[PDB]
Structure formats: structure tokens, C-alpha cells
């Protein structure tokens, strides 16, 4: 099945349902307090002001989502972008994150980004495997950088290189809008 | 013989003599516009509400400075802290930076952080060797992540481990006045 489409604020509810147990009971995310539905709604809208936000859907329900965000604040970094992907429990390994990425990555390239970074709390062999298969390269690991759920956690970064690190790059454009 | 003291907003114009050419003509900082003196005042003053900010003085004039800043926004990262040290061109480069860190690092340890991170625009043999002798470890490099002054630049990160990654860490305390 599976169709990828642009996310909407109305997807907040299913997205929150996917994301809340990840915040609650895993070190996948370094957030501590479960974000409300209303919060995820605002995160969707704000992200869309500049970046793609995507959902994967199967028979009308959201089974995963993906979005991009700013890699770092300072001007010279503006060709670097962060990517985030999540899949509902029980729908993993069925290729959903892969499909999300196969849409998100080309979108980012055409916007003007030169590289995308995925932050992965380690260990997570299934997430590493997926990024290795997609062609990301592991460029570094911040060891025991986070504390959550009674343990210290490594965070590795995986880089997808869009190429075209040419000599006169132009600033990336808005997904659908702003400058 | 160079002395280290905590910085004050009234040091802004002297700090700027150091920062301005770094911004205008090096990749040492990925900022592109020189902050106004008013901005520098607010930066120093804002950092101090929670973090140490230091200057190195030789014959009464600021020849270098250093400050800590938040590593990442998410709650689980609150024991990680970023460090930044800049030194004027000319004499005693390494000595100045070393003395700065010899004060900054122990201050951050006492405050309750578990690790500090320095980002280095690469190559920079002088800075790398300095971090290495201070006991930092190179944990990753973000290749071609920034574009500035007609080239793409890698940024490597060096980690200072304060130890004490125990099971019940208490949140870090504010440098002079609570966080
Ligand atoms: C291990 As993780 O929860 O993917 C940390 C990334 C977070 N967006 C931050 O920058 O603070
Ligand atoms: C190359 As560099 O100015 O050492 C990168 C750090 C920058 N402060 C940021 O995090 O935005
Ligand atoms: Na990190
Ligand atoms: Na970076």
C-alpha cells in the first residue's frame, strides 16, 4: 500500500500518538515530557513555513512521518539540514522509513541543501542499517552525551551528501514559501 | 604574564577587536556579519546568567576570551556543554588558549556538567594539537558542512570528558546565580 504526502496540522493527532510512547519509554528521542497534540500541531505548522513535513499513509491512517529542520544556527551552515523520521510500532521493517526518505531526500536536494544529517541514539542497529542502506555515512559519535531512563546514551550522526559542493552556492529555498 | 578573569559587558569593544576579523576574514567562526557592540554586550550579559565567560588580559588589554554555551536544546542533553575560545593573532596564541581552558574546564566540572564540546573548523593544526594536549578526544567530523569565503569547510568536534557519568546525576548549576 503506502502513499507519501505532505503533512497537515490535522495529522497532529496520529503523529502525537506515534511519538508520545517514544518520548515516554525510549531513548530514541531525547525529549522527556510527552508533547501534547496541540504542541505537535504547532510544530507541524512552524516546520512547513520553511521545510518539508511528510506523512506515510496506509488506508487513510498515518503510519509514519518525516520532517527536516535547521542543522545549526549560524549563517555559513545554511546548506546543512537535519532530518527526522519515525514509524508507528507494528509497521516497521515494512519499508516505511525508506519510502519517507526516498521522498524527503530529493525534495531537500531540489531546495538547495548540500547535506542532510540524521542523529541516532545508539545502539539502534535497525536504524543504522537503514541509513547505511540509503547511502548515509557515519561521520561521528557523541559518546554518553545524553542521560535518560537511567542510562547515558551515545548519539551518532549520519550524513547524506547531496553533492554539488560547487563554488557559488545559492541560499536554499522554502518548501512552498518563505525566505 | 597573562591573567584570566570573568568577562563583563564593558569588555565588549575589546572582545570585538578579536571577533570582528574572525568573522570577516576566517572560517574560524561561521557567523558572517560582525555583531554590533550593543549585541556583543547582550551576548556577554546573556551567557553570564548561566555560564562562565572569561577574558585573558595582558598588560591590561583583552588578548583572548572564552565562554560556555548550551550543547543542544532537548532535556536529556543538559549535562553536555559547548566551549568556545578565541585568541588574538600574534604572540602566545597557545598559552593564552591553554590558560583560558585551564580555568574554564574546572569551572564547568564544579557546575555539574559531564562533558564539554569544542567545534573546530578544519584544518587547524594549532588548535587541534592544543585540544589534544588538554585531554580532548576527536569524536567526529562534519565534512564540508559550512560554506564561507569561497570554500566548503569541515567542522570537527573534540570532547572533554569530566567523568562522573553515574546513575543519579543532578542538574547542572548556574555560574554565579541559579539556573
Ligand atoms: C537523540 As535526539 O532526541 O534525535 C536530539 C536532537 C534534538 N532535535 C536537539 O537538537 O536538541
Ligand atoms: C565553525 As563554528 O562558528 O566553530 C560552529 C558553531 C556555531 N557556533 C553554531 O553552533 O551555530
Ligand atoms: Na549531540
Ligand atoms: Na556541525
Residue numbers in the entry:
A (entry chain A), B (entry chain B): 4 to 182
List passages from the publication reporting this PDB structure.
The arsN1 gene encodes an N-acetyltransferase that confers resistance to arsinothricin with high selectivity over the related antibiotic phosphinothricin. Here we show that ArsN1 acetylates both AST and PPT but with higher affinity for AST, indicating that ArsN1 is an AST-selective N-acetyltransferase. The overall conformation is a three-layer α/β sandwich fold, a typical GCN5-related N-acetyltransferase fold. PpArsN1 forms an asymmetric homodimer in solution, as shown by the extensive interactions of the subunits and size-exclusion chromatography, similar to related N-acetyltransferases.
